[PDB]
Amino acid sequence: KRAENMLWHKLPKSIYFRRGSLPIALDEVITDGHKRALIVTDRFLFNNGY
Amino acid sequence: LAKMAVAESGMGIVEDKVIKNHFASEYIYNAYKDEKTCGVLSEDDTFGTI
């Protein structure tokens, strides 16, 4: 008999969003014990303080 | 100014009030030479505080 393929709904574990929630969300990765971070940016975003 | 304060009170050495009046005029100038005290001190754009 006919059966249907299993679908899903997969997202990141946390999708933080508002007008200015960049440093409030970056305080979560501080309290998780992370001590060494690598930041991959564009060449324009590094020369403009982003 | 060091010779007037010994002529008035009569309780000190005139040679020690020279380097005390010198401490009160060039060490007080040197520490607080460029310290913001009049206009906008700090400003935050992510948190919105002036």
Swiss-Prot record, chain A:
Disruption phenotype: Deletion mutant cannot grow aerobically in minimal media, is extremely sensitive to oxidative stress and shows morphologic defects that are associated with deficient septum formation. In addition, mutant displays increased levels of internal peroxides and increased protein carbonyl content. Both acetaldehyde dehydrogenase and alcohol dehydrogenase activities are thermolabile in temperature-sensitive mutants. Induction: Expression is about 10-fold higher during anaerobic than during aerobic growth. Contains two transcriptional start sites, which are both functional. Both start sites are NarL repressible in the presence of nitrate and activated by RpoS. Fis is required only for transcriptional initiation from the upstream start site. Fnr can regulate expression from the downstream transcriptional start site only in the physical absence of the upstream region. However, under all experimental conditions tested, only the upstream start site is active and acts as a silencer of downstream transcription. Transmembrane segments: none annotated. NAD(+) 2 binds at D42. Under fermentative conditions, catalyzes the sequential NADH-dependent reduction of acetyl-CoA to acetaldehyde and then to ethanol. Under aerobic conditions, despite the reversibility of the two NADH-coupled reactions, wild-type E.coli cannot grow on ethanol as the sole carbon and energy source due to the down-regulation of adhE transcription and the inactivation of the enzyme by metal-catalyzed oxidation (MCO). Nevertheless, in the presence of oxygen, AdhE may act as a hydrogen peroxide scavenger and have a protective role against oxidative stress. Forms long filaments, called spirosomes. Forms rod-like ultrastructures composed of 20-60 identical subunits. Two monomers form a dimer in a head-to-head arm-crossing fashion through the ALDH domains. Subsequently, two dimers form one helical pitch via the interaction of ADH domains in a tail-to-tail manner. These units are further assembled into spirosomes. Formation of these spirosomes is required for activity. Can be isolated in vitro in a wide range of oligomeric states. In the N-terminal section; belongs to the aldehyde dehydrogenase family. Contains an N-terminal aldehyde dehydrogenase (ALDH) domain and a C-terminal iron-dependent alcohol dehydrogenase (ADH) domain, interconnected by a short linker. ALDH and ADH activities are topologically separated in the compact spirosome architecture. Has previously been proposed to have pyruvate formate-lyase (PFL) deactivase activity and to catalyze the quenching of the PFL radical in an Fe(2+), NAD and CoA dependent reaction. However, it was shown later that AdhE does not catalyze the deactivation of active PFL. Inactivation of PFL is attributed to the CoA and Fe(II) present, which appear to increase the rate of deactivation. This is Bifunctional aldehyde-alcohol dehydrogenase AdhE. The gene is adhE.
